[PDB]
C-alpha cells in the first residue's frame, strides 16, 4: 500500500489550522509520524500539503530533500475531504490515511489496519475504506469534550471520485496529540519514560 499524510494545517484535534511542525524532543510532530511510516510495510509516502501552509510545506520539503520514498504533493489538504478526494482521485491504488498530529508507534498499526481491512475485502468484496477509530471518552486529550468519535490512528481509502463503504475497527491503542504546552509534557514523558 502507499501511505499518504496530509499536513497542511490539518489534523485530528479542533479545527482551523493545526500545527504539524511542533516538535518535540528532536522532530516535527509530522516527522515522528512520518518515520514509521517510512519504514512501516508501506512502499512511498505521499505527503499531502497546501498552498495555505507551506511552511509545513517548505520544512517537509526542506526535511526530506533527500526523498528516496517520500513525495510531496499539493492538494486541498486545507479541507480534510478535500484533500481526501483530490487524493483518491490521482491515486491508482489504495492508499493509507493518517493525522499529522499523531505521535505514537505506528509500526504495528500499520500493519494491523492493512490486513485487517484486507481481511473485510476478502469476505466481503464490497467494502472499499476502513476506518479505525476510539471512543472520545478514553481518548487521552479531549479538547472540548468526551462527546464524539476519534480516529484511533490511520485510515484506508480506495481511488475512486466519491465517498466509499467505510468500515469500523475499534481498538485500545491510544494515540498523543499536541496542540499546546501540556501535551508537550504529555508527550514528553512517555519518551522519558522510553529513555529511562
Given at each position: 500500500?502507499d501511505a499518504?499524510?496530509?499536513?497542511?494545517?490539518?489534523?485530528?484535534?479542533?479545527?482551523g489550522?493545526?500545527?504539524?511542525?511542533?516538535?518535540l524532543?528532536?522532530?516535527?510532530?509530522?516527522?515522528?509520524?512520518?518515520?514509521?511510516?517510512l519504514?512501516?510495510?508501506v512502499?512511498?509516502?505521499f505527503?499531502?500539503?497546501?498552498?495555505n501552509?507551506?511552511?509545513?510545506?517548505?520544512?517537509?520539503?526542506s526535511?526530506?530533500k533527500?526523498?528516496?520514498?517520500?513525495?510531496?504533493?499539493?492538494?486541498?489538504?486545507?479541507?480534510?475531504?478535500?484533500?481526501?478526494?483530490?487524493?483518491?482521485?490521482?491515486?491508482?491504488?489504495?492508499f493509507?490515511?493518517?493525522?499529522?498530529?499523531?505521535?505514537?508507534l505506528?509500526?504495528?498499526?500499520?500493519?494491523?489496519?492493512?490486513?485487517?481491512?484486507?481481511?473485510?475485502?476478502?469476505?466481503?468484496?464490497?467494502?472499499?475504506?476502513?476506518?479505525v477509530?476510539?471512543?472520545?471518552?478514553?481518548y487521552?486529550?479531549?479538547s472540548?469534550?468526551?462527546?464524539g468519535?476519534?480516529?484511533?490512528?490511520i485510515?484506508?481509502?480506495?481511488?475512486?471520485?466519491?465517498?466509499?463503504?467505510?468500515?469500523?475497527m475499534?481498538?485500545?491503542?491510544?494515540?498523543?496529540?499536541?496542540?499546546?504546552?501540556?501535551?508537550?509534557?504529555?508527550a514528553?514523558?512517555?519518551?522519558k519514560?522510553?529513555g529511562?
Amino acid at each position: 500500500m502507499d501511505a499518504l499524510i496530509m499536513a497542511g494545517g490539518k489534523g485530528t484535534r479542533m479545527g482551523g489550522v493545526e500545527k504539524p511542525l511542533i516538535k518535540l524532543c528532536g522532530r516535527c510532530l509530522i516527522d515522528y509520524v512520518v518515520s514509521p511510516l517510512l519504514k512501516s510495510k508501506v512502499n512511498n509516502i505521499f505527503i499531502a500539503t497546501s498552498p495555505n501552509t507551506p511552511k509545513t510545506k517548505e520544512y517537509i520539503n526542506s526535511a526530506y530533500k533527500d526523498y528516496k520514498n517520500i513525495v510531496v504533493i499539493d492538494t486541498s489538504g486545507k479541507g480534510y475531504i478535500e484533500d481526501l478526494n483530490e487524493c483518491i482521485g490521482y491515486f491508482s491504488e489504495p492508499f493509507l490515511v493518517v493525522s499529522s498530529d499523531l505521535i505514537n508507534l505506528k509500526s504495528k498499526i500499520i500493519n494491523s489496519i492493512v490486513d485487517y481491512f484486507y481481511c473485510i475485502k476478502a469476505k466481503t468484496p464490497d467494502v472499499e475504506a476502513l476506518a479505525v477509530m476510539i471512543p472520545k471518552e478514553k481518548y487521552p486529550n479531549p479538547s472540548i469534550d468526551f462527546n464524539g468519535l476519534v480516529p484511533a490512528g490511520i485510515n484506508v481509502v480506495s481511488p475512486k471520485h466519491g465517498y466509499q463503504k467505510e468500515e469500523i475497527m475499534v481498538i485500545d491503542e491510544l494515540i498523543f496529540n499536541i496542540n499546546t504546552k501540556d501535551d508537550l509534557k504529555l508527550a514528553e514523558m512517555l519518551l522519558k519514560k522510553d529513555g529511562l
